[PDB]
């Protein structure tokens, strides 16, 4: 029982793009861009679609950097999150109903206003290492269990 999601990180030499989630699940946290993958689109299609919906940005190339599985206690579907990075973007990011985008210096990541699991796996993304992760949550604050490792193939 799993469902595909995407997560897109615009990572440039000295800054990373994040959006403050305005509504929905996990609102009030700085997030990457992404969401559910729809029927009839590839995972990467879905990633590019969510990026454009949430920020207006398009990209020449997205690169697979990771995969994270989330379990929430009592919820039947696991989240199968495919994580992507890009450096070159096309456009200037703008606010959507869902996300307010801002750039952050790579030593000023707002981990305290981000999902707790970000503190574990995001530095690996910043270090340009591919990774597989698993995080078990009870609610949105408490990691009950996790595994994390670098991988050669995402
Ligand atoms: N940049 N990080 C995210 O956007 C992010 C990180 N962890 C999560 C864990 C569970 C979940 F439902 C969402 C996220 C998430 N969006």
Coordinates of N, CA, C and O and ligand atoms in Angstrom, one line a residue:
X1 N 0.8 -1.2 0.0 CA 0.0 0.0 0.0 C 0.9 1.2 0.0 O 1.3 1.7 1.1
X2 N 1.1 1.8 -1.2 CA 2.0 3.0 -1.2 C 1.4 3.9 -2.3 O 0.7 3.5 -3.2
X3 N 1.8 5.2 -2.3 CA 1.3 6.2 -3.2 C 2.5 7.1 -3.6 O 3.3 7.5 -2.7
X4 N 2.6 7.4 -4.9 CA 3.8 8.1 -5.4 C 3.6 9.6 -5.1 O 2.5 10.2 -5.3
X5 N 4.7 10.2 -4.6 CA 4.8 11.7 -4.5 C 6.1 12.1 -5.1 O 7.1 11.4 -5.2
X6 N 6.2 13.5 -5.3 CA 7.5 14.1 -5.8 C 7.9 15.2 -4.8 O 7.1 15.7 -4.1
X7 N 9.2 15.5 -4.9 CA 9.7 16.6 -4.1 C 10.9 17.2 -4.9 O 11.8 16.5 -5.3
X8 N 10.8 18.5 -5.2 CA 11.8 19.1 -6.1 C 12.6 20.2 -5.3 O 12.0 21.1 -4.7
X9 N 13.9 20.1 -5.3 CA 14.8 21.1 -4.7 C 15.6 21.8 -5.8 O 16.4 21.2 -6.5
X10 N 15.4 23.1 -5.8 CA 16.1 24.0 -6.7 C 17.4 24.4 -5.9 O 17.3 25.2 -5.0
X11 N 18.5 23.8 -6.2 CA 19.7 24.0 -5.4 C 20.8 24.6 -6.4 O 21.2 24.0 -7.3
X12 N 21.2 25.8 -6.1 CA 22.1 26.6 -6.8 C 23.4 26.7 -6.0 O 23.5 26.2 -4.8
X13 N 24.5 27.2 -6.6 CA 25.8 27.2 -5.9 C 25.8 27.8 -4.4 O 26.4 27.2 -3.5
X14 N 25.0 28.8 -4.2 CA 25.0 29.5 -2.9 C 23.7 29.6 -2.2 O 23.6 30.3 -1.2
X15 N 22.6 28.9 -2.7 CA 21.3 29.1 -2.2 C 20.4 28.0 -2.7 O 20.6 27.4 -3.7
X16 N 19.3 27.8 -1.9 CA 18.3 26.7 -2.2 C 17.0 27.3 -2.1 O 16.7 28.2 -1.2
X17 N 16.0 26.9 -2.9 CA 14.7 27.4 -3.0 C 13.7 26.6 -2.1 O 13.8 25.3 -2.2
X18 N 12.9 27.2 -1.3 CA 11.9 26.5 -0.5 C 10.6 27.4 -0.5 O 10.7 28.6 -0.8
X19 N 9.5 26.7 -0.2 CA 8.3 27.4 -0.2 C 7.6 27.2 1.1 O 7.5 26.0 1.6
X20 N 7.0 28.2 1.8 CA 6.2 28.1 3.0 C 4.9 27.6 2.6 O 4.1 28.2 1.8
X21 N 4.5 26.4 3.1 CA 3.3 25.8 2.7 C 2.1 26.5 3.3 O 2.0 26.6 4.6
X22 N 1.2 27.1 2.5 CA 0.2 28.0 3.0 C -1.1 27.3 3.4 O -1.8 27.8 4.4
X23 N -1.4 26.1 2.9 CA -2.6 25.4 3.1 C -2.3 23.9 3.0 O -1.2 23.5 2.5
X24 N -3.2 23.0 3.5 CA -3.1 21.6 3.3 C -2.2 20.9 4.4 O -2.0 21.5 5.5
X25 N -1.7 19.7 4.1 CA -1.0 18.9 5.0 C 0.4 19.4 5.3 O 1.1 19.6 4.3
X26 N 0.7 19.7 6.5 CA 2.0 20.2 6.8 C 2.1 21.7 6.5 O 3.3 22.2 6.4
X27 N 1.0 22.4 6.4 CA 1.1 23.9 6.3 C 1.9 24.5 7.4 O 1.9 24.1 8.6
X28 N 2.5 25.6 7.1 CA 3.4 26.3 8.1 C 4.8 25.9 8.2 O 5.5 26.3 9.1
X29 N 5.2 25.0 7.3 CA 6.6 24.5 7.2 C 7.2 24.9 5.8 O 6.5 25.0 4.8
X30 N 8.5 25.2 5.8 CA 9.2 25.3 4.6 C 9.4 24.0 3.9 O 9.9 23.0 4.6
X31 N 9.0 23.8 2.6 CA 9.0 22.6 1.9 C 9.7 22.7 0.6 O 9.9 23.8 0.1
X32 N 10.1 21.6 0.1 CA 10.4 21.6 -1.4 C 9.1 21.6 -2.1 O 8.0 21.6 -1.6
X33 N 9.1 21.7 -3.5 CA 7.9 21.7 -4.3 C 7.6 20.3 -4.7 O 8.5 19.5 -5.1
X34 N 6.3 19.9 -4.7 CA 5.9 18.6 -5.1 C 4.5 18.3 -4.7 O 3.7 19.1 -4.3
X35 N 4.2 17.0 -4.8 CA 2.8 16.6 -4.5 C 2.6 15.2 -5.1 O 3.5 14.5 -5.5
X36 N 1.3 14.8 -5.0 CA 0.9 13.5 -5.5 C 1.2 13.4 -7.0 O 1.0 14.4 -7.8
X37 N 1.6 12.2 -7.5 CA 1.7 11.9 -8.9 C 0.4 11.4 -9.4 O -0.3 10.6 -8.8
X38 N -0.1 12.0 -10.5 CA -1.4 11.7 -11.0 C -1.4 10.5 -11.9 O -0.3 10.1 -12.4
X39 N -2.5 9.9 -12.1 CA -2.7 8.9 -13.2 C -2.4 9.5 -14.5 O -2.8 10.6 -14.8
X40 N -1.6 8.9 -15.4 CA -1.4 9.3 -16.7 C -0.2 10.3 -16.9 O -0.1 10.9 -18.0
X41 N 0.6 10.4 -15.9 CA 1.9 11.2 -16.0 C 3.0 10.4 -15.4 O 2.8 9.6 -14.5
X42 N 4.2 10.6 -15.9 CA 5.4 10.0 -15.3 C 5.6 10.7 -13.9 O 5.1 11.7 -13.6
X43 N 6.5 10.0 -13.1 CA 6.9 10.7 -11.9 C 7.5 12.0 -12.1 O 7.2 13.0 -11.5
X44 N 8.4 12.1 -13.1 CA 9.1 13.3 -13.4 C 8.2 14.4 -14.0 O 8.3 15.6 -13.6
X45 N 7.3 14.0 -14.9 CA 6.2 14.8 -15.3 C 5.5 15.4 -14.1 O 5.3 16.6 -14.0
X46 N 5.1 14.6 -13.1 CA 4.4 15.1 -12.0 C 5.2 16.1 -11.2 O 4.7 17.0 -10.7
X47 N 6.6 15.8 -11.1 CA 7.4 16.8 -10.4 C 7.4 18.1 -11.1 O 7.2 19.2 -10.5
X48 N 7.6 18.1 -12.4 CA 7.6 19.4 -13.2 C 6.3 20.1 -13.1 O 6.2 21.3 -13.0
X49 N 5.2 19.3 -13.1 CA 3.9 19.9 -13.0 C 3.7 20.6 -11.7 O 3.2 21.7 -11.6
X50 N 4.0 19.9 -10.6 CA 3.8 20.5 -9.3 C 4.7 21.7 -9.1 O 4.3 22.8 -8.5
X51 N 6.0 21.7 -9.6 CA 6.8 22.9 -9.5 C 6.2 24.1 -10.2 O 6.2 25.2 -9.7
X52 N 5.7 23.9 -11.5 CA 5.0 25.0 -12.2 C 3.8 25.5 -11.5 O 3.6 26.7 -11.4
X53 N 3.0 24.5 -11.0 CA 1.8 24.9 -10.2 C 2.1 25.7 -9.0 O 1.5 26.7 -8.7
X54 N 3.1 25.3 -8.3 CA 3.4 25.9 -7.0 C 4.3 27.1 -7.0 O 4.3 27.9 -6.0
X55 N 5.0 27.3 -8.1 CA 6.0 28.4 -8.2 C 6.1 29.1 -9.5 O 6.9 30.0 -9.6
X56 N 5.4 28.6 -10.6 CA 5.6 29.1 -11.9 C 6.9 28.7 -12.6 O 7.0 29.0 -13.8
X57 N 7.7 27.9 -12.0 CA 9.0 27.6 -12.6 C 8.9 26.4 -13.5 O 8.2 25.5 -13.2
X58 N 9.7 26.4 -14.6 CA 9.9 25.3 -15.4 C 11.4 25.0 -15.4 O 12.2 25.9 -14.9
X59 N 11.8 23.9 -15.8 CA 13.2 23.5 -15.7 C 13.6 22.7 -16.9 O 12.8 22.1 -17.6
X60 N 14.9 22.9 -17.3 CA 15.4 22.1 -18.4 C 15.6 20.7 -18.0 O 15.2 19.8 -18.8
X61 N 16.2 20.4 -16.9 CA 16.5 19.0 -16.5 C 16.2 18.9 -15.0 O 16.6 19.8 -14.2
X62 N 15.6 17.8 -14.6 CA 15.5 17.3 -13.2 C 16.3 16.1 -13.0 O 16.4 15.2 -13.9
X63 N 17.0 16.0 -11.9 CA 17.9 14.8 -11.6 C 17.4 14.1 -10.4 O 17.2 14.8 -9.4
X64 N 17.2 12.8 -10.5 CA 16.8 12.0 -9.3 C 18.0 12.0 -8.3 O 19.1 11.7 -8.6
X65 N 17.7 12.5 -7.1 CA 18.7 12.5 -6.1 C 18.3 11.6 -4.9 O 19.2 11.2 -4.1
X66 N 17.0 11.2 -4.8 CA 16.7 10.3 -3.6 C 15.3 9.8 -3.7 O 14.5 10.1 -4.5
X67 N 15.0 9.0 -2.7 CA 13.7 8.3 -2.5 C 13.5 8.2 -1.0 O 14.4 7.7 -0.3
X68 N 12.4 8.7 -0.4 CA 12.1 8.6 1.0 C 10.7 7.9 1.1 O 9.8 8.3 0.4
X69 N 10.6 7.0 2.0 CA 9.3 6.4 2.3 C 8.9 6.9 3.7 O 9.7 6.9 4.6
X70 N 7.6 7.4 3.8 CA 7.0 7.8 5.1 C 5.9 6.9 5.4 O 5.1 6.6 4.6
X71 N 5.9 6.5 6.7 CA 4.7 5.9 7.3 C 4.2 6.8 8.3 O 4.9 7.4 9.1
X72 N 2.9 7.0 8.3 CA 2.2 7.6 9.5 C 1.4 6.6 10.2 O 0.6 5.8 9.5
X73 N 1.5 6.6 11.5 CA 0.7 5.6 12.3 C -0.7 5.7 12.0 O -1.3 6.8 12.0
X74 N -1.4 4.5 11.8 CA -2.8 4.5 11.5 C -3.2 4.8 10.1 O -4.4 4.8 9.8
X75 N -2.3 5.2 9.2 CA -2.6 5.5 7.8 C -2.2 4.4 6.9 O -1.1 4.0 6.9
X76 N -3.1 3.9 6.0 CA -2.8 2.7 5.3 C -1.8 2.9 4.1 O -1.1 1.9 3.9
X77 N -1.8 4.0 3.5 CA -0.8 4.2 2.4 C 0.5 4.8 2.9 O 0.5 5.8 3.6
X78 N 1.6 4.1 2.6 CA 2.9 4.8 2.7 C 3.1 5.8 1.7 O 2.5 5.8 0.6
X79 N 3.9 6.8 2.0 CA 4.3 7.9 1.0 C 5.6 7.5 0.3 O 6.6 7.4 1.0
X80 N 5.5 7.3 -1.0 CA 6.7 6.9 -1.7 C 7.2 8.2 -2.5 O 6.8 8.5 -3.6
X81 N 8.1 8.9 -1.8 CA 8.5 10.3 -2.3 C 9.7 10.1 -3.1 O 10.8 9.7 -2.6
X82 N 9.7 10.5 -4.4 CA 10.8 10.6 -5.3 C 11.4 12.1 -5.2 O 10.6 13.0 -5.5
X83 N 12.6 12.2 -4.9 CA 13.2 13.5 -4.6 C 14.1 13.9 -5.8 O 14.8 13.0 -6.4
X84 N 13.9 15.1 -6.3 CA 14.6 15.6 -7.5 C 15.4 16.9 -7.1 O 15.0 17.6 -6.2
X85 N 16.5 17.1 -7.9 CA 17.2 18.4 -7.8 C 17.4 18.9 -9.2 O 17.4 18.2 -10.2
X86 N 17.5 20.3 -9.2 CA 18.0 20.9 -10.4 C 18.7 22.2 -10.0 O 18.5 22.7 -8.9
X87 N 19.6 22.7 -10.9 CA 20.3 23.9 -10.7 C 19.8 25.0 -11.6 O 19.3 26.0 -11.1
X88 N 19.8 24.8 -12.9 CA 19.2 25.8 -13.8 C 17.7 25.7 -13.7 O 17.2 24.6 -13.9
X89 N 17.1 26.8 -13.5 CA 15.6 26.9 -13.6 C 15.3 27.9 -14.7 O 16.1 28.7 -15.2
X90 N 14.0 27.9 -15.2 CA 13.5 28.8 -16.1 C 12.4 29.6 -15.5 O 11.4 29.1 -15.1
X91 N 12.7 30.9 -15.3 CA 11.8 31.8 -14.7 C 12.2 32.3 -13.3 O 13.3 31.9 -12.8
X92 N 11.4 33.2 -12.8 CA 11.6 33.7 -11.4 C 10.4 33.1 -10.6 O 9.3 33.2 -11.0
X93 N 10.7 32.6 -9.4 CA 9.7 31.9 -8.6 C 8.7 32.9 -8.1 O 9.1 34.0 -7.6
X94 N 7.4 32.6 -8.1 CA 6.4 33.5 -7.6 C 5.4 32.7 -6.7 O 5.4 31.4 -6.8
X95 N 4.7 33.4 -5.8 CA 3.8 32.8 -4.9 C 2.7 32.2 -5.6 O 2.2 32.7 -6.6
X96 N 2.2 31.0 -5.1 CA 0.9 30.4 -5.5 C 0.0 30.4 -4.3 O 0.4 30.7 -3.2
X97 N -1.2 29.9 -4.5 CA -2.1 29.7 -3.4 C -1.5 28.7 -2.4 O -1.8 28.8 -1.2
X98 N -0.7 27.8 -2.9 CA -0.1 26.7 -2.0 C 1.2 27.1 -1.3 O 1.5 26.6 -0.3
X99 N 2.0 27.9 -2.0 CA 3.4 28.1 -1.5 C 3.9 29.5 -1.7 O 3.6 30.2 -2.7
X100 N 4.6 30.0 -0.7 CA 5.3 31.3 -0.8 C 6.8 31.0 -0.9 O 7.4 30.5 0.1
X101 N 7.4 31.2 -2.0 CA 8.8 30.8 -2.2 C 9.8 31.9 -1.8 O 9.6 33.1 -1.9
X102 N 10.9 31.4 -1.2 CA 12.1 32.2 -0.8 C 13.3 31.4 -1.0 O 13.4 30.2 -0.8
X103 N 14.4 32.2 -1.3 CA 15.8 31.6 -1.3 C 16.4 31.6 0.1 O 16.2 32.6 0.8
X104 N 17.2 30.6 0.4 CA 17.9 30.5 1.6 C 19.4 30.2 1.3 O 19.7 29.2 0.6
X105 N 20.3 30.9 2.0 CA 21.7 30.5 2.0 C 21.9 29.2 2.6 O 21.3 28.7 3.5
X106 N 22.9 28.4 2.0 CA 23.1 27.0 2.3 C 23.5 26.8 3.7 O 23.4 25.6 4.2
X107 N 23.9 27.8 4.5 CA 24.1 27.6 5.9 C 23.0 28.3 6.7 O 23.2 28.6 7.9
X108 N 21.9 28.7 6.1 CA 20.8 29.3 6.8 C 19.5 28.5 6.5 O 18.4 29.1 6.3
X109 N 19.6 27.2 6.6 CA 18.4 26.4 6.3 C 17.5 26.4 7.5 O 17.9 26.1 8.6
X110 N 16.2 26.7 7.3 CA 15.3 26.9 8.4 C 14.8 25.6 9.0 O 13.6 25.3 9.1
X111 N 15.7 24.7 9.5 CA 15.4 23.3 9.9 C 14.3 23.4 11.0 O 13.6 22.4 11.1
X112 N 14.3 24.4 11.8 CA 13.3 24.3 12.9 C 11.9 24.6 12.4 O 11.0 24.1 13.1
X113 N 11.7 25.2 11.3 CA 10.4 25.3 10.6 C 10.2 24.4 9.5 O 9.5 24.7 8.5
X114 N 10.9 23.2 9.5 CA 10.8 22.2 8.4 C 10.5 20.9 9.1 O 10.6 20.7 10.3
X115 N 10.1 19.9 8.2 CA 9.8 18.6 8.7 C 10.9 18.1 9.4 O 12.1 18.3 9.1
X116 N 10.7 17.4 10.6 CA 11.8 16.9 11.4 C 12.8 16.0 10.6 O 14.0 16.0 10.9
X117 N 12.3 15.2 9.7 CA 13.1 14.3 8.9 C 14.1 15.1 8.0 O 15.1 14.5 7.6
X118 N 13.8 16.3 7.6 CA 14.7 17.1 6.8 C 16.0 17.2 7.5 O 17.1 17.3 6.8
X119 N 16.1 17.3 8.8 CA 17.3 17.5 9.5 C 18.2 16.3 9.3 O 19.5 16.4 9.4
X120 N 17.7 15.1 9.0 CA 18.5 13.9 8.7 C 18.9 13.8 7.3 O 20.1 13.6 7.0
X121 N 18.0 14.0 6.3 CA 18.3 13.7 4.9 C 18.7 14.9 4.1 O 19.5 14.8 3.1
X122 N 18.2 16.1 4.4 CA 18.5 17.3 3.6 C 20.0 17.5 3.5 O 20.5 17.9 2.4
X123 N 20.8 17.4 4.6 CA 22.3 17.7 4.4 C 22.9 16.7 3.4 O 23.9 17.1 2.8
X124 N 22.3 15.5 3.2 CA 22.8 14.7 2.1 C 22.5 15.2 0.8 O 23.4 15.1 -0.2
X125 N 21.3 15.8 0.6 CA 21.0 16.4 -0.7 C 22.0 17.6 -0.9 O 22.5 17.8 -2.0
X126 N 22.2 18.4 0.2 CA 23.1 19.5 0.0 C 24.5 19.1 -0.3 O 25.3 19.9 -0.9
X127 N 24.9 17.9 0.1 CA 26.2 17.3 -0.1 C 26.2 16.5 -1.4 O 27.2 15.9 -1.7
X128 N 25.2 16.6 -2.2 CA 25.1 16.0 -3.6 C 25.4 14.5 -3.6 O 26.1 14.0 -4.5
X129 N 24.9 13.9 -2.5 CA 24.9 12.4 -2.4 C 23.5 11.8 -2.6 O 22.6 12.4 -2.1
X130 N 23.4 10.7 -3.3 CA 22.1 10.1 -3.5 C 21.8 9.3 -2.2 O 22.7 8.8 -1.5
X131 N 20.5 9.1 -2.0 CA 20.1 8.5 -0.7 C 18.8 7.8 -0.8 O 17.9 8.2 -1.6
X132 N 18.6 6.8 0.1 CA 17.3 6.2 0.4 C 17.0 6.4 1.9 O 17.9 6.2 2.7
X133 N 15.8 6.8 2.2 CA 15.4 7.0 3.6 C 14.0 6.4 3.9 O 13.2 6.1 3.0
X134 N 13.8 6.2 5.2 CA 12.5 5.7 5.6 C 12.2 6.4 7.0 O 13.1 6.4 7.9
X135 N 11.1 7.0 7.1 CA 10.8 7.7 8.4 C 9.3 7.3 8.8 O 8.4 7.4 8.0
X136 N 9.2 6.8 10.0 CA 7.9 6.5 10.6 C 7.5 7.6 11.5 O 8.2 7.9 12.5
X137 N 6.4 8.2 11.2 CA 5.9 9.4 12.0 C 4.6 8.9 12.8 O 3.8 8.2 12.4
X138 N 4.5 9.5 14.0 CA 3.2 9.6 14.7 C 2.7 11.0 14.7 O 3.3 11.9 15.4
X139 N 1.8 11.3 13.8 CA 1.5 12.7 13.7 C 2.7 13.3 12.9 O 3.4 12.7 12.1
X140 N 2.9 14.7 13.0 CA 3.7 15.4 12.2 C 5.0 15.9 12.9 O 5.8 16.6 12.2
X141 N 5.2 15.6 14.1 CA 6.3 16.1 14.9 C 7.3 15.0 15.4 O 8.5 15.3 15.6
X142 N 6.9 13.7 15.5 CA 7.6 12.7 16.2 C 8.0 11.6 15.2 O 7.2 10.9 14.7
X143 N 9.3 11.5 15.0 CA 9.9 10.4 14.3 C 10.0 9.2 15.2 O 10.8 9.2 16.2
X144 N 9.2 8.1 15.0 CA 9.3 6.9 15.8 C 10.5 6.0 15.4 O 11.1 5.4 16.3
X145 N 10.7 5.9 14.1 CA 11.8 5.1 13.6 C 12.3 5.7 12.3 O 11.6 6.4 11.6
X146 N 13.5 5.4 11.9 CA 14.0 5.8 10.6 C 15.2 4.9 10.2 O 15.9 4.4 11.0
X147 N 15.4 4.8 8.9 CA 16.6 4.3 8.3 C 17.0 5.3 7.2 O 16.2 5.9 6.5
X148 N 18.4 5.5 7.0 CA 18.9 6.4 6.0 C 20.2 5.9 5.6 O 21.1 5.4 6.4
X149 N 20.5 5.9 4.3 CA 21.7 5.4 3.7 C 21.9 6.1 2.3 O 20.9 6.5 1.7
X150 N 23.2 6.3 1.9 CA 23.5 6.7 0.6 C 23.4 5.5 -0.4 O 23.6 4.4 0.0
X151 N 23.1 5.8 -1.6 CA 23.0 4.8 -2.7 C 23.7 5.2 -3.9 O 23.8 6.4 -4.2
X152 N 24.1 4.3 -4.7 CA 24.7 4.5 -6.0 C 23.6 4.8 -7.1 O 23.8 5.6 -8.0
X153 N 22.5 4.1 -7.0 CA 21.3 4.3 -7.9 C 20.1 4.7 -7.1 O 19.8 3.9 -6.2
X154 N 19.5 5.8 -7.4 CA 18.3 6.2 -6.7 C 17.1 5.3 -7.0 O 16.5 4.7 -6.1
Ligands
LIG1 N1 11.7 19.8 2.1 N2 11.1 18.8 2.8 C1 9.8 18.5 2.5 O1 9.1 19.2 1.7 C2 9.2 17.4 3.3 C3 10.0 16.7 4.1 N3 9.5 15.6 4.8 C4 8.2 15.3 4.8 C5 7.7 14.3 5.5 C6 6.3 13.9 5.5 C7 5.5 14.6 4.6 F1 4.3 14.3 4.6 C8 6.0 15.7 3.9 C9 7.3 16.0 3.9 C10 7.9 17.1 3.2 N4 7.0 17.7 2.4

